[PDB]
Each structure stands twice: as structure tokens, then as C-alpha cells.
């Protein structure tokens, strides 16, 4: 049995998602007989009552934002149940490196690269993984019409949970979308919109897990509400895909994981067009672990229960560090 | 005037180079009237006496041995406007220290966490070079089989650590039998090892200061295959010519490519990009350095001087670019 500190919370716009991931991981690791310290990185160690309260606090319909978030802003292994910001972009990983601490997920370079959607997409192309055309703001509206056209997606280069993201259907929607994305980070991506199906591939310990599909119905994007509200969307693992397409999504996800030098586990997101082509959006080094999240379902479809998933992640981190 | 803490020394194999860079920066910023604190990151804050002692230490012909290397906000540092990072290699240059400073809310010089980590990873940097339209020699990462090496790289080839500086750990391999000993050597100096095609020809370098290229420099190697630790840091060991005696279109192309590299890796403040110019006139980008040497024999200060920028002014400008970024 291990002594695990589960770090969660943080000060990114994914703080509420992180609280929920942390609460599931804490409960699972305790159920497997480990000693677990619950650490909200915004405040410190929690006692049993505060910790029972956080296990009951479900993600809300909008992310923490504006003034509310501004106000907030012997262990064998640190389980990083953070998402976004310094917890995911390599900053915390470097700090733990410097202190000689073992932790879960990817190292500091890998985490920084995966968080920079632009850089990651250059690396996807270098690894033979197809990805949609993109520009970084500022781009003249002339350059946008010339290279991407509409519809397109505007998104922060380094968010999660669909924070700051808009579909832009015409020139008049473009500036407001860029302004919105710029409230959530310093770089902003404009990316060709890929119509089609929403697919995702988890990786654990350099093996692909069963592909999952998110059934969006009429929605163009998979948004914060549908990601985290129980029952909001049907998510199917293994996805109802032709075997060759599912195999190709798994092959591509492992190529991405290796190209970015990731460790432990990851989750890669794709859009699948009606012509059968997969377009890689991004990869996540600290994917969500909430009760609605995608990676636990991929693991369960592989025959890996949630406590075992958490334990295996811990051991992979110890082995790496 | 600024209050600057110059961080130097460290624990990488480039420690002696960093002591010399830090001594240069300290004296230059003092000439310009700033208040300068000298911090050896391996020990702590230095006094006037040990400044003279430690800082006068000269780079030797060989780097420190493994055994010797294995051997902020506090008091005086209150009110520091910027940390001038006079470190080279290791955690000082690979993004680790930059992330620590980010977490503490401190301003510092050079590039940020991601940019520094990428530029240090020679492999990743070269993938980005190609993505930006910057030519770079073919490479494999160890292990590579005899067939892979023979088919894709050929001999001679270069073996080097993926993340060193100062030509530490690097060998020219002339035949298959030399390959394993070179990989083992490079693996004493980091975790990944690159096998890169050898580019015969001339040795060229381009400094960048805040999104402008500086005059190109050439290092005249004589018969030597590579520019090594001894010849980098012993005064007058090689001639270094700024501006280089190159056809102007070749020098202009080297500057264009260096700026593309600097922008592609999201660097800030300054950098120095190294190229080999092959015998057919084509430039091959080796790497970019986010914390290039600043010693009295170093390349970046000479490129700045050729641009009309004295060393104290260069150091001040770097401080202000770091403060602006942070
Ligand atoms: N180019 C695109 N084409 C179509 N849909 C897109 C595109 N980019 C993003 N989306 C939609 O927006 C959602 C979020 O985008 P993306 O995965 O890039 O960002 P994220 O906020 O980092 O996601 P996560 O919550 O997985 O961290 C996607 O799941 C998809 O529904
Ligand atoms: N592929 C190559 N072909 C020819 N010479 C090479 C090649 N790679 C490296 N060299 C030689 O080795 C030297 C050091 O290589 P490189 O610049 O890649 O490493 P470094 O140790 O990071 O250097 P620096 O001291 O600039 O940090 C070069 O200046 C060059 O003389
Ligand atoms: Mg994401
Ligand atoms: Mg996603
Ligand atoms: Mg170098
Ligand atoms: Mg070099």
C-alpha cells in the first residue's frame, strides 16, 4: 500500500472539474487501502468533513470565472488531480522535479507541449497525425477568409473543458470570439471546423484503450455543460465504429502520446468526418477523472476498474520518477 | 536604474562557463549603474571579496568532472526588479528554473518555461525547425540499428546528448564500430542521445536580440571537424569573424532562418542559433540556445558589438525585455 497525496483544486478555470476529479480519486484510492492526503492547492490539507463536502460538490453549469476565480487566485507519490493552468502546463511538474518528489502523469516538457495546442499540432503533423488547418491570432480577416474560411473554431491556445471556445459562422462573429478566448489566456487559435463525429482515445502505460464516441445530437461542439452534467450526453465505449477506423484512431493516439514524450496516461480527441477521416484536435496529459469523465469509461471498457486505474497511474509515476 | 540579481554557476557541466558569463554580466550591469547582487545557485549570495575570487575563475580546457558536480525573496533579494539568468545547461536553461520563477511571480531574463524546454530538447527543436521551413540534418534517436544508421545517416555522423551545451558529450563517429562507445559517452551526460548526419563545411552563428538578427559570425576551425570545449572558451584558440566573410545572400538567409527559429520556438529576449554551411552553400540548423554564452570569448557579445551594441547596453536591454515579458 502507498501513501498518496492527491493534489487538486488549483486556480485555473477547471478548478471545479479538478475538485470533482480529486474527490473520485481520493475515494477510489482509500477504497483500495491506501493512505491518502487530500490537498487543495488553493488552501492546503483538508479534514474529513471538508473532504466529505468536496466529494458532494458537483461541477456547476459555468466554470469559475471573473471575480469569483480572482478571489481564489512520507508521501510515496503526488497524484495530480489538477487540470489546466500551472497544474497541467508543466509548471507544477518542474517544481516537483526540483523538490525530488514523485508524481503522476507527464513530465514538465511533455506537459508544456501538450498544453500548447499550436505546438502540439505541429508535432502531430511531424508524426504523421492529420490535424485541421489553423492560424494564431492576430490574423487579418483577409488571411482568415483565405486560409480557413467559415465555419471555424476560435479557442484559447491553452485552456481545457471547452473554456473560451466559440464556433464562428461568419466574419461578424470572429472578433467577439477572439476577445472571449483572450480572457482565458494569452494566445488564441483559429482552426478549421471539422463537421462530423466526436471520438476520443485514452492511453494507459503505452497501450490504447477502447475508442469512445460522444453523441452530440444537434450540437456543433462538446461544451462545458455537456462534459460535466450527469446524463447530458450519451457516451459510448467501445464506440460504434467500423473496426478499421477505431484501430486507426488508436494507432494515431499512440503516435501522439509518443511524439510528445508523454508518460503514464493521456487522452486524445478527434473529429471524424463523413469521409472516414480522423482529425486530431489535441491531447490531454491530465484528463478528467470525474464521475462523468471519459478516461474512466475507456478504462472500464478495457476491463480496468476505477481504483485499479488510479493505482496503476500512481505506480507508473513512481516508476518514472 | 534596476536592482538585478545575477544567478550563475549551477551544477551542469557548463558551470565554469556560467561563472564566467555571470562575472561578465555583473561587471557590465555595474558599469551601467544598476545595483547587482551575485548569486551562485550552488551556494548562495556572494560578498565583495568572494565575488573577486569566484568571478575571476577562468574557464579551463576541460569541463568539470562528474564527481565535482555531484559534490529567492530572502533578505537581500527583496525588491529585485529582475533575475538575470547567467546559467547554462541543466535546470537553469531547460525551463525548470523558469517555472520556479514563474511560480514565485519573479521577473527573469531570456525565454519562458515552454520555450526553454523545447530549445533544450535538440530533437523536438529540430522537428519544429522543419515545421517552420528551416533546413536541418537528418537524425535518429538512440537506439538505432546498424541498418537504420547505414540507410538514413551514413558515416561520419555526430553523436551528441539531446540536451547538453558547450560540445559536452559529443563525438564524431567515423564507422559503425565507434558508434556504441559514442552513445555510451553521450549517455553519461543526459537521458536521450541523438545521432545526426554530419554536415561538412563552415561553422556559422546568428544572434537575435528582441526580434532582430545581429551580424552573422563565422568560426574558423582550421582542420577541425567540430567546435569543441577547449576552442570555445580559451581566448584566441580560433578566429571568430563578425560580420562573417560570406556572400551577402547567404548571410541574409542565415539571419532570416534564425529569426524563423526564434519565433517558431516562442523564444523571448535574445537567442543564438548555430548552423553548418555545407560545401554547396546550403545552411543546416543545428540548434538554438536560449541562454547563450556571455563570456569574454563568447559569440553573442561579439555579434552585438558588430551591430553597434556594447556589452553593458546588451545586458541592460535583456533585463528590460525580461521585465516587460513578466
Ligand atoms: N476544429 C474543430 N472542429 C470541430 N469541433 C471542434 C474543433 N475544435 C474543438 N472542437 C469542439 O470543441 C471541443 C473542445 O475542443 P478541444 O478538445 O480542442 O479543447 P479543450 O477545451 O482542451 O477540451 P478538454 O475538455 O478535452 O480538455 C471538442 O471536443 C469539439 O467538440
Ligand atoms: N550535425 C553536425 N555536423 C557537423 N558538425 C556538427 C554537427 N552537430 C554538431 N556539430 C559540431 O559540434 C558543435 C556543437 O554542436 P551543437 O551546437 O549542436 O551543441 P551544443 O553543445 O549545444 O553547443 P553550444 O556550445 O553552442 O551550446 C557545433 O558547433 C559543430 O562544430
Ligand atoms: Mg484539453
Ligand atoms: Mg478536448
Ligand atoms: Mg547549445
Ligand atoms: Mg551550438
**What is d(CA A168, CA A163) in angstroms, rounded to the nearest whole number?**
15
Grid cell digits, residue A65: 470565472
Whether residue A170 is preceded by a cis peptide bond, meaning omega within 30 degrees of 0, is: no
What grid cell was written down for A116?
500548447
Distance from the Cα of residue B139 to its chain's centroid: 20
CA of B121 to the centre of ligand 2 (A): 14
Specify the residue for cell string 562507445: B181
Helix (H, G, I), strand (E, B) or coil at A65: coil
Q: Are A37 and A79 in contact (CB under 8 A)?
A: no
CB neighbour class for A93 (10 Å; exposed up to 12, middle 13-18, buried from 19): buried
Estimate to the nearest angstrom the gap between the alpha carbon of A57 and the chain centroid: 20
Of residues A291, A299, A306, A284, the one with CA closest to residue A87: A284
Q: Is the peptide bond before B156 cis (omega within 30 degrees of 0)?
A: yes
Task: Decide: B88 and B17 in contact? Cβ < 8 Å.
Answer: yes
Q: Does A25 touch chain B (CB under 8 A)?
A: no
Measured from the CA of A221, which atom of ligand 1 is nearest? 31
Helix, coil or strand: residue B44: strand
Grid cell of B51 as nine digits: 565575488
Taking CA atoms, B75 is separated from A76, B3, B42, B80, in Å, by: 34, 13, 18, 10
* CA distance linking residue B241 with residue B303, whole number of Å: 9
Contact (CB<8Å) A109/B121: yes
Residue B109: how many CB atoms within 10 A of its CB? 28
Give the residue from chain A lying closest to B264, CA to CA. Answer: A119
Phi, psi of A80 (to 5 degrees): -85, 100
- The helix/strand count (H/E) of chain A reads as 13, 14
Q: What backbone torsions phi and psi does residue B238 show, to the nearest 5 degrees?
A: -135, 155
Other beta carbons within 10 Å of A261: 18
What is the C-alpha to C-alpha distance for residues A108 and B88, in angstroms, rounded to an integer? Answer: 18
Identify the CA nearest to B279 among candidates B223, B198, B202, B203. B202
Buried b / exposed e over B30-68, threshold 16 CB at 10 Å, is eebebebbbbbbeeeebeeeebeebbeeebeeebeeeee
Residue A273 labelled as part of a binding site = no
d(CA A29, CA B318): 48
Phi and psi, residue A79, nearest 5°:
-85, 115
Cβ burial, residue B249 (10 Å; 0-12/13-18/19+):
exposed
A14 is catalytic: yes
Quick one: cell of A212? Answer: 469512445
Ligand 2 atom with the shortest distance to the CA of B299: 26
Q: Where are the beta strands (DSSP E) in chain A?
A: 3-8, 35-40, 44-45, 77-80, 134-136, 152-156, 166-168, 188-192, 197-204, 207-208, 212-215, 234-236, 265-272, 278-284
Angle at the Cα of B299 from the Cα atoms of B27 and B132, rounded to 5 degrees: 125
Q: Which residues of B touch A91 (CB under 8 A)?
A: 99, 102-103, 113
Q: Which three cell numbers stand for residue B20?
A: 564566467
- Bridge partners, residue A38, by sequence: A6
The Cβ of residue B163 has, within 10 Å, a number of other Cβ atoms equal to: 24
Residues in chain B: 326
User: B292-311 burial, b if ≥16 CB within 10 A, otherwise e?
Assistant: bbbbbbbbbbbbbbbbebeb
Give residue for cell 490535424. Answer: A131
CA of A200 to the centre of ligand 5 (A): 38
CATH fold label, A134-192: Dna Ligase; domain 1 (3.30.1490)
Nearest residue to A90 (alpha-carbon basis) of B301, B112, B21, B35: B112
Inter-residue contact B11 to B66 (CB < 8 Å): no
B234 CA: distance to closest CA in chain A (Å):
33
Among candidates A193, A192, A190, A194, which has minimal Cα distance to A141?
A190
Method underlying the structure: X-ray
For residues B26, B29, B30, B36, the Cα torsion angle rounded to the nearest 10 degrees is: -60
Question: Distance, CA B274 to ligand 6 centroid (Å)?
Answer: 5
> What whole-number distance in Å separates Cα of residue A260 and Cα of residue A111?
8
- B122 CA distance to ligand 6 centroid (A)? 10
Note whether A98 contacts B: Cβ–Cβ < 8 A.
yes
Buried b (16+ CB within 10 A) or exposed e, A204-241: beeebbbbbbbebeeeeebbbebbbeeeebebebebeb
CA of A239, closest CA in chain B: separation in Å?
A: 33
Evaluated on CA atoms A276, A277, A281, A285, the torsion sign reads: positive
A231: left (phi over 0), alpha (psi -120 to 50) or beta: left
Burial A154-174 (b: 16+ CB within 10 A, else e): bbbbbbbbbbbbbbbeeeebb
Residue B260 and residue B133 in contact, taking contact as beta carbons nearer than 8 Å: yes
The residue nearest atom 11 of ligand 2, judged by CA position, is B226
Rounded Cα distance between B72 and A85, Å, is 23
Nearest to B61 by CA among B253, B234, B177: B234
Q: Using the structure block, give the residue that is written with the C-alpha cell 467577439.
A: A176
Find out whether A284 is annotated in a ligand binding site. yes
Q: List b or e across A180-193, with b for residues whose CB sees 16 or more CB atoms inside 10 angstroms.
A: bbeebbeebbbbbb
Query: Atom 12 in ligand 2: which residue has the minimum CA distance?
Result: B226
CB contact under 8 A, A108 and B117: yes
The arrangement of strands across the sheet holding B139-141 comes to B139-141, B193-197, B157-161, B171-173
DSSP structure class, residue B213 = E
Which three-class secondary structure state does DSSP give residue A216?
coil
How far apart, in whole angstroms, are the C-alpha atoms of residue A183 and residue B170? 46
The Cα–Cα gap between A236 and A238 comes to 6
Read out DSSP for A283-304?
EESS---STT-HHHHHHHHTT-
Mention the CATH class of domain B139-197: alpha beta
DSSP string for B264-320: HTT--SEEEEEEEEETTS-EEEEEEESS---STT-HHHHHHHHTT--HHHHHHHHHH
| Alpha-carbon dihedral sign for residues B119, B120, B126, B128 | negative
Do the Cβ atoms of A96 and A78 come closer than 8 Å? yes
Longest dimension (CA), chain A: 60
CA atoms within 13 A on the CB side of B159: 27
Cβ distance B277 to B204 under 8 Å? yes
Rounded Cα gap, residues A164 and A184, in angstroms: 6
Q: Answer left, alpha or beta for residue B44, where phi above 0 means left and psi between -120 and 50 means alpha.
A: left
Which residues from chain A sit within 8 angstroms of residue B117, using beta carbons?
Answer: 90, 108-109, 112-113
Whole-Å CA distances, A278 to A157, A252, A253:
21, 9, 11
Q: What value, to the nearest 5°, has the Cα angle with vertex B85 and ends A100 and B237?
A: 110
Tell the residue number behind the cell numbers 478555470, with chain if given: A13
b vs e for B124-148, b when ≥16 Cβ sit within 10 Å of the residue's Cβ? bbbbbbeebebebbebbebebeeee
Integer Cα distance of A89 and A227 in angstroms: 21
CB A11 within 8 A of CB A70: no
Q: Give me the sheet containing A44-45, strands edge to edge.
A: A44-45, A35-40, A3-8, A77-80
**Distance from C-alpha of B122 to C-alpha of B136, rounded to nearest angstrom:** 11
> Of the residues B160, B195, B220, which should be mutated to test ligand 2's pocket, given the most ligand atoms within 8 Å of the CB?
B160
Give the SS3 label for residue B224: coil
| Rounded-to-integer distance, Cα A150 and Cα A138, Å | 17
Catalytic, B61? Answer no
Give the DSSP letter of residue B178: G
The response to whether A189 counts as a known ligand-binding position is yes
d(CA A186, CA A172): 22
Q: Is B1 helix (H, G, I), strand (E, B) or coil?
A: coil
Q: Give the phi and the psi of residue B39 in degrees, each rounded to 5.
A: -120, 110
SS3 B209: strand
Contact A130, A142 (CB under 8 A): no
Nearest-5° angle of CA A317, CA B117, CA B69?
80
Here the cell at position A253 is 493516439
State the DSSP H helix or E strand holding residue A187, giving kind and residue range, or none if neither.
Answer: none
B326 in contact with A, Cβ within 8 Å: no
Amino acid at each position: 500500500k502507498l501513501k498518496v497525496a492527491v493534489l487538486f483544486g488549483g486556480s485555473s478555470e477547471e478548478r471545479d472539474v479538478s475538485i470533482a476529479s480529486g474527490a473520485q480519486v481520493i475515494q477510489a484510492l482509500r477504497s483500495a487501502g491506501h493512505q491518502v492526503l487530500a490537498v487543495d492547492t488553493a488552501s492546503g490539507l483538508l479534514g474529513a468533513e471538508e473532504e466529505r463536502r468536496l466529494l458532494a460538490s458537483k461541477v456547476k453549469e459555468v466554470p469559475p470565472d471573473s471575480d469569483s476565480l480572482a478571489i481564489i487566485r512520507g508521501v510515496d507519490v503526488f497524484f495530480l488531480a489538477l487540470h489546466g493552468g500551472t497544474g497541467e502546463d508543466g509548471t507544477l511538474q518542474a517544481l516537483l522535479d526540483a523538490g525530488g518528489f514523485a508524481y503522476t502523469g507527464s513530465g514538465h516538457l511533455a506537459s508544456a507541449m501538450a498544453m500548447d495546442k499550436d505546438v502540439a499540432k505541429r508535432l502531430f503533423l511531424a508524426a504523421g497525425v492529420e490535424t485541421a488547418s489553423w492560424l494564431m491570432a492576430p490574423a487579418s480577416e483577409e488571411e482568415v477568409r483565405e486560409q480557413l474560411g467559415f465555419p471555424l473554431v476560435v479557442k484559447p491556445n491553452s485552456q481545457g473543458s471547452t473554456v473560451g471556445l466559440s464556433i464562428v459562422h461568419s466574419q461578424a462573429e470572429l472578433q467577439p470570439a477572439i476577445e472571449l478566448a483572450g480572457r482565458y489566456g494569452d494566445e488564441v487559435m483559429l482552426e478549421r471546423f471539422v463537421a462530423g463525429r466526436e471520438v476520443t482515445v485514452g492511453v494507459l502505460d503505452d497501450q490504447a484503450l477502447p475508442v469512445g464516441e460522444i453523441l452530440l445530437g444537434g450540437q456543433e461542439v462538446f461544451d462545458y455543460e455537456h462534459k460535466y452534467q450527469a446524463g447530458a450526453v450519451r457516451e459510448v465505449f467501445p464506440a460504434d465504429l467500423p473496426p478499421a477506423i477505431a484501430a486507426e484512431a488508436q494507432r494515431l493516439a499512440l503516435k501522439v502520446h509518443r511524439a510528445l514524450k508523454l508518460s503514464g496516461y493521456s487522452r486524445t480527441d478527434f473529429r471524424l468526418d463523413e469521409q472516414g477521416r480522423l482529425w486530431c484536435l489535441e491531447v490531454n496529459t491530465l484528463p478528467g477523472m470525474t464521475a462523468t469523465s471519459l478516461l474512466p469509461q475507456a478504462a472500464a471498457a478495457a476491463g480496468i476498474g476505477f481504483a485499479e486505474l488510479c493505482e496503476r497511474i500512481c505506480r507508473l509515476g513512481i516508476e518514472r520518477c
